[PDB]
Amino acid sequence: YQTFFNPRTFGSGEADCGLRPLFEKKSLEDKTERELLESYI
Amino acid sequence: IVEGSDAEIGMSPWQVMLFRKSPQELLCGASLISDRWVLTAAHCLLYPPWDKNFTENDLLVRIGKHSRTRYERNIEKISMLEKIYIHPRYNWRENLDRDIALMKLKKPVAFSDYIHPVCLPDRETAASLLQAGYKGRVTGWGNLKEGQPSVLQVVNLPIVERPVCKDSTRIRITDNMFCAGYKPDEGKRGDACEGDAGGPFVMKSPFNNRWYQMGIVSWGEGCDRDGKYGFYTHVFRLKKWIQKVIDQFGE
DNA sequence: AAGTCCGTGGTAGGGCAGGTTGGGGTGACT
Ligand SMILES: Cn1c(CNc2ccc(C(=N)N)cc2)nc2cc(C(=O)N(CCC(=O)O)c3ccccn3)ccc21
Ligand SMILES: [Mg+2]
Ligand code: NA
């Protein structure tokens, strides 16, 4: 991922956006995300 | 959410609740895209046909919430709105074209296990994920059928072919919206409902494992009717407006 | 598949640009 906005106006958060502390950060998958993944095939 | 399930704790940490102060009621969903910017639907703040017209002081936002009711100490956070920006091309009468608003928090919110922003799509994520049959995730505390739920609901819905969207409604739809939901012949069901409007339609990239908000819950004829689909605001298409508002008026 | 359409009101002012707004894409239609 690469940033698009200026943190001064946008705020913090963009660098690490869309990665959940309790799932992606822990290498745990939620109970239905697999459904999404399988739809992209 | 109709035909959904209970969200797991921390499953949608960009979920935001948009409340009216007095009398206290849940108005809409919304999403956290940074420590101080929130995305929602324009009609949540301004919709003259329902004499809906809201200023910054009328509203409250609650973040990091699982249970609709009880206060969740050291988990949820309260915030006030500094300023609201509705898209100038928002059409509240004909077709809800460009149904999007940006909302600036009066102070930055701290991130946690329960509070974390969603990514905004770029051209390539739009090109890769916006395909008929590809599924995204809708979340909210709106009605379970056409009883508002105890805890946040989640359902996964396929993006639909454009010609089907168009034939599903008399409304003159535009390139600034898309539709999602199962067809009658697919057997499966599910949809957003009243109270889910303004919440995010998210999608997980198989390329970088990140969640992207591709859509905003905008409008639908009833909820979960056969031959009807939920309409979502096309976030990527409006990303330039987002950037301009944030550049021109941020912190 | 040569191309052509996506602004002057509309959701709405003062004006024919552009602004927080008429870009370019899941392009669509012929
Ligand atoms: C339900 N809902 C909401 C908000 N909550 C919401 C609820 C459910 C869903 C959902 N079912 N996923 C998604 C959002 N706003 C709505 C505006 C109209 C409406 O304005 N029009 C005219 C303009 C236009 O909508 O084009 C329209 C459409 C068909 C007929 C007549 N009128 C109908 C329904 C609306
Ligand atoms: Mg104009
Ligand atoms: Na449906």
Author numbering:
A (entry chain L): 1, 1A, 1B, 1C, 1D, 1E, 1F, 1G, ...
B (entry chain H): 16 to 36, 36A, 37 to 60, 60A, 60B, 60C, 60D, 60E, ...
Which sentences from the paper describe this structure?
Potent and selective inhibition of the structurally homologous proteases of coagulation poses challenges for drug development. Hematophagous organisms frequently accomplish this by fashioning peptide inhibitors combining exosite and active site binding motifs. Inspired by this biological strategy, we create several EXACT inhibitors targeting thrombin and factor Xa de novo by linking EXosite-binding aptamers with small molecule ACTive site inhibitors. The aptamer component within the EXACT inhibitor (1) synergizes with and enhances the potency of small-molecule active site inhibitors by many hundred-fold (2) can redirect an active site inhibitor’s selectivity towards a different protease, and (3) enable efficient reversal of inhibition by an antidote that disrupts bivalent binding.
We investigated whether an EXACT inhibitor against thrombin could be rationally created de novo by chemically conjugating the direct thrombin inhibitor dabigatran (DAB, Ki = 4.5 nM)13 to the DNA aptamer HD2214. The crystal structure of the HD22-thrombin complex indicates that the distance between HD22’s 5’ terminus and thrombin’s active site is ~40 Å15. Therefore, we extended HD22’s 5’ terminus with a poly-(7)-deoxyadenosine linker (estimated length of 49 Å)16 to facilitate the simultaneous binding of both the HD22 and the DAB moieties. DAB’s carboxyl group which is not directly involved in binding thrombin15 was then conjugated to the 5’ amino modifier at the terminal of the linker. The resulting EXACT inhibitor is named HD22-7A-DAB. The x-ray structure of thrombin complexed with HD22-7A-DAB at 2.2 Å resolution confirms the bivalent binding mechanism of HD22-7A-DAB. The diffraction data allows unambiguous placement of both aptamer and DAB moieties onto thrombin. The carboxyl group of DAB moiety is displaced from the reported thrombin-dabigatran complex possibly to accommodate the linker’s position. Only one deoxyadenine of the 7 nt linker at the 5’ terminus of HD22 is unambiguously resolved in the structure. At lower map contour levels, a partial second nucleotide is resolved, as is density potentially representing other nucleotides in the linker. These observations imply high flexibility of the linker, which presumably facilitates bivalent binding.
